[PDB]
């Protein structure tokens, strides 16, 4: 019988990366490209309509204008692979692949998009050189609401202000900015640690006073 094999039902994809979800179908001897039909859709959105060896770009949804691709080199290997570039939060959901090569079958794949606070921007500005009052600032972008834990090598745990805002570059994910205003010394090492409300493991940046 004709069955479509899915290498993994759950894909956890990091934000900003490329996603390559696979659906495999049996190929015997060779690929009859004329009789092969591949269809990919997410939440009633036409992603890929591949008929007679030719993609149908006119039916493709606007949001998937030049993000989706069908790796045709893998089609001969009995593996229809869907590639999406610049994965965003709206891409999470159930994807449906229907393959008609002789027989026909469809399968579902659940995609979860991870948006960790990986990219950490830092700055150290001097406020009052007399009292060595420095302001340390750490900014990261991610979706699950997060807080910043400021730690030092010597003073150990200190205290800082953390704020939640909407992003300006990308989707509704939040741009968390925390500032620590303390009097420090030269080459005193400070750390800012991003810990969200959810499960993912924390990420820490290092600040060295100039």
């Amino acid at each position: 019988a004709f069955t479509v094999t899915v290498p993994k039902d759950l894909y956890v994809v990091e934000y900003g990366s490329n996603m390559t979800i696979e659906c495999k179908f049996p190929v015997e001897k060779q690929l009859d490209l004329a009789a092969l039909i591949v269809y990919w859709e997410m939440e009633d959105k036409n992603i890929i309509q591949f008929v007679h060896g030719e993609e149908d770009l006119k039916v493709q949804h606007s949001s998937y204008r030049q993000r989706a691709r069908l790796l045709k080199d893998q089609l001969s290997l009995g593996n229809a692979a869907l590639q999406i570039t610049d994965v965003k939060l709206q891409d999470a959901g159930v994807y449906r692949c229907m393959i008609s090569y002789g027989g026909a079958d469809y399968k579902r794949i659940t995609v979860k998009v991870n948006a960790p606070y990986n990219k950490i921007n830092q700055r150290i500005l001097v406020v009052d050189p007399v009292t060595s009052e420095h302001e340390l600032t750490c900014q990261a972008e991610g979706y699950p609401k997060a807080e910043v834990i400021w730690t030092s090598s010597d003073h150990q745990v200190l205290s800082g202000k953390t704020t939640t805002t909407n992003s300006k570059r990308e989707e509704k994910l939040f741009n968390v900015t925390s500032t620590l205003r303390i009097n420090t010394t030269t080459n005193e090492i400070f750390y800012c640690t991003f810990r969200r409300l959810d499960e993912p493991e924390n990420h820490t940046a290092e600040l060295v006073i100039p």
């Binding site: 039909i37 009633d44 007679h52 149908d56 229907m98 008609s100 026909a104 079958d105 469809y106």
Partner: protein, 96 residues
Amino acid sequence: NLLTSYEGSFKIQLILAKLELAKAPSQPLSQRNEELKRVEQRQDRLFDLLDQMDVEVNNSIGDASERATYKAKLREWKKTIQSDIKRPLQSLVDSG
């Protein structure tokens, strides 16, 4: 050609709807109650595809020798939709 885009879309929707009716009973009751409505969307889409293909058939190249030939294919496909999709769909909404 536009009609080829219609042929591809119609064939894909037809196969997908039949498979969704086949896989509905092997699916959670909660998860399936919306899939039965999704099939209704696919069912309405197939009728719109045939009705629009009728416009493009005459507006595209060919003659009456082609006109009658293609519309006979469309009549067979129309009965295919009612026999394989709509009728089995109502035999699933009754259960439960």
